[PDB]
Paper text:
As expected, steady-state kinetics reveal that mutating Ser69 to alanine completely abolishes enzyme activity. Once it was clarified that Ser69 was the only residue being phosphorylated during catalysis, we exploited this catalytically impaired mutant to trap the bisphosphorylated intermediate that has been proposed for this class of phosphomutase. The protein was crystallized with Glc-1,6-bisP and the structure was refined to 1.9 Å resolution with a single protein molecule in the asymmetric unit. The overall structure of AfAGM1_S69A–Glc-1,6-bisP complex shows a closed conformation, compared with the open/semi-open conformations exhibited by the two monomers in the AfAGM1–GlcNAc-6P–Mg+2 complex. However, the inactive AfAGM1_S69A mutant–Glc-1,6-bisphosphate complex has an overall structure with a closed active site and represents the reaction intermediate with Glc-1,6-bisphosphate buried in the active pocket. The complete closure of the active site is achieved by the establishment of extensive hydrogen bond interactions between the reaction intermediate Glc-1,6-bisphosphate and the protein. In addition, the 1-phosphate group establishes hydrogen bond interactions with R33, H70, R289 and a water molecule, the 6-phosphate group makes hydrogen bond interactions with T29, R505, S507, T509, R514 and the backbone of G508, and the 3-OH and 4-OH groups of the sugar make hydrogen bond interactions with E380 and the backbone of V363. Thus, extensive hydrogen bond interactions are established with residues from all the domains resulting in a closed conformation. This provides a snapshot of the reaction either immediately after phosphoryl transfer to form the intermediate or before the second phosphoryl transfer to re-phosphorylate the enzyme. Although the inactive AfAGM1_S69A mutant–Glc-1,6-bisphosphate complex was crystallized in the presence of 10 mM MgCl2, the structure reveals the absence of this metal and the presence of a water molecule instead.
Numbering used by the authors: 2 to 542
């Protein structure tokens, strides 16, 4: 790196101060913490984004400033690689080295990195960024801008966007004018693509009943309202938006949003939904969705990420069979350990498909899903998508089927591949997917719920002094450490019918998570509470 660059790096860093004693870690999805801790971190990330882009011969790299499901006082920064995927895993160590460098030395760490990565410093760097509605985002975008200006990257501020909009923009700008061309790299282009794909998938069917979408008082509320202006007119889809208060920042994810619904297993307390109204909740950056409704008995029923995965795997399997291509589109379902055991059992015994369990975090699920022609992957919390391999897409595009029924199914599959946000999932595209599926099957939430019955389950968020002593393995289902704790968990889970519990450190918040399921409500709650007390005791010595 040039002497003027190395100077502008140290000059710009002078404006900030590292918080004393904090060690930063990349975590499940990127640096995330209380927003007053973030300046030097974000500055470090601007440096890393420049290096990444240069290493990739000036391809657009994205930065999304968000803490996603986290409470409003947090923020964070996620890196996006050129095709929309999460920043390559090996590069999380480089980010963490820059973020932990004394500020005085950040210039030297930068040069140390150019040598180690072997980066051609004459390559252009091109970075595009956006943020959700969080109060700290503008300050952090200032810092990011300061880093990128110092390193002389070309950069574009896309203002407020959902996480998946930013991933979409990155993929578009890196594919524009090629055979791979994903769309126009603007917010309008995103709405146009979703709308056009949904029109095609919907040919010949209609949605029945309204959909009431809790938008977590985040950026998804205004963007979904905008998307609705683009959507086709006679599909029967009737969306009502609730919780779109992007004006009061304390409202974000507050008593509403997918994370509230999933962890508490209840509708937002401000919900005005009637019995049998079909509902869904997005989260604060619109990258999770779940569904839920009040049944005929006025009882809340949850349709979470694994319900979406299984819904999509069933539909795709029926379309591939109908299109005469079942033998050529092998479907697999990727899960994590948070998936309800009943959903795993359904995938195995009713859909008759392979499933794979991976670590928590979309990067891991996406990785495992590459092993299938069609890889359906969701986390229970409502992240996820469906990936189609090169060979699958070629089969879907080029098959010429014998009859009109087969052609209609083939065309529905082709449209689905344009609707489904490839790589990292997109909650709003997943919502249109679910709507299209129910419309084709003719199902209401009643029939979808009846596919399988979830085991009663429970999440407990446990605060400990030192979550780094909780080290997990086997798709994070067992604790290697602290010594003796897995033994206790194995012993506890065996006392309950269908008892299954595991504990692991969160990589997005300072807590340990406990999950438990069993055959009955009393058993699952007892198992979760006894496991959480064993964790709290261990983590708090
Ligand atoms: O907040 P988001 O929507 O970015 O979600 C992030 O955190 C979730 C919880 O991770 P953990 O249990 O380590 O805290 C993960 O399941 C998810 O893949 C990740 O992208
Ligand atoms: Cl907004
Ligand atoms: Cl939890």
């Amino acid at each position: 790196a040039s002497p003027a660059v190395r100077k502008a790096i140290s000059d710009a860093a002078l404006q900030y101060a590292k918080p004393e004693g904090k060690i930063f870690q990349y975590g499940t999805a990127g640096f995330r913490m209380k927003a007053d801790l973030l300046n030097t971190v974000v500055y470090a990330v601007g440096l890393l984004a420049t290096l990444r882009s240069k290493k990739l011969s000036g391809q657009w790299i994205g930065v999304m400033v968000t803490a996603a499901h986290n409470p409003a006082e947090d923020n964070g920064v996620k890196l996006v690689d050129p095709m929309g995927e999460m920043l390559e895993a090996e590069w999380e160590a480089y980010a963490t080295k820059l973020a932990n460098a004394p500020l005085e030395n950040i210039g030297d760490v930068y040069d140390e990195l150019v040598k180690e990565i072997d980066v051609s410093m004459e390559n252009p760097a091109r970075v595009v960024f956006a943020r959700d509605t969080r109060a700290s985002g503008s300050r952090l975008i200032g810092v990011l801008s300061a880093a990128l200006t110092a390193t002389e990257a070309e950069f574009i501020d896309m203002k407020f966007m959902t996480t998946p909009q930013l991933h979409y923009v990155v993929r578009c700008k890196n594919t524009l004018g090629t055979q791979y061309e994903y769309g126009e790299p603007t917010e309008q282009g995103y709405y146009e693509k979703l709308a056009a794909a949904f029109k095609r998938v919907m040919r010949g069917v209609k949605v029945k009943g309204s959909l009431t979408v809790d938008c977590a008082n985040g950026v998804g509320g205004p963007k979904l309202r905008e998307l609705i202006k683009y959507l086709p007119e006679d599909t029967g889809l009737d969306i009502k938006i609730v919780n779109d208060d992007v004006i009061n920042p304390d409202s974000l994810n507050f008593e509403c949003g997918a994370d509230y619904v999933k962890t508490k297993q209840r509708a937002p307390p401000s919900s005005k939904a009637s019995i049998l109204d079909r509902c869904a909740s997005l989260d604060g950056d619109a990258d999770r969705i779940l569904y839920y409704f009040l049944d005929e008995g006025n009882v809340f029923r949850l349709l979470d990420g694994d319900r979406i995965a299984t819904l999509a795997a069933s539909f795709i399997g029926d379309l591939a069979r109908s299109a005469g291509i079942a033998q050529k589109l092998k479907i697999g379902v990727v899960q994590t350990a948070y998936a309800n055991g009943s959903s795993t059992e359904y995938i195995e015994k009713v859909l008759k498909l392979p499933s794979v369990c991976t670590n928590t975090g979309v990067k891991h699920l996406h990785h495992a899903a590459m092993r299938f022609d069609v890889g359906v992957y969701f986390e229970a919390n409502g992240h996820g998508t469906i990936t189609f391999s090169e060979n699958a897409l070629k089969t879907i595009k080029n098959t010429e089927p014998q009859s009109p029924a087969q052609q209609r199914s083939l065309e529905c599959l082709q449209a689905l591949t344009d609707l489904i946000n490839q790589a990292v999932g997109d909650a709003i595209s997943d919502m249109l997917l679910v709507e299209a599926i129910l419309a084709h099957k003719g199902w209401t939430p009643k029939e979808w719920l009846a596919t399988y019955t979830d085991l009663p389950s429970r999440l407990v968020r446990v605060e400990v002094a030192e979550r780094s002593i909780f080290k997990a393995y086997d798709a994070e289902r067992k604790l290697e450490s602290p010594p003796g704790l897995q033994a206790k968990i194995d012993s506890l889970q065996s006392r309950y019918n269908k008892g299954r519990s595991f504990a692991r450190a969160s990589g997005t918040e300072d807590a340990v998570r406990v999950y438990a399921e069993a055959a009955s409500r009393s058993e699952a709650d007892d198992l979760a509470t006894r496991v959480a007390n064993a964790v709290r005791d261990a983590g708090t010595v």
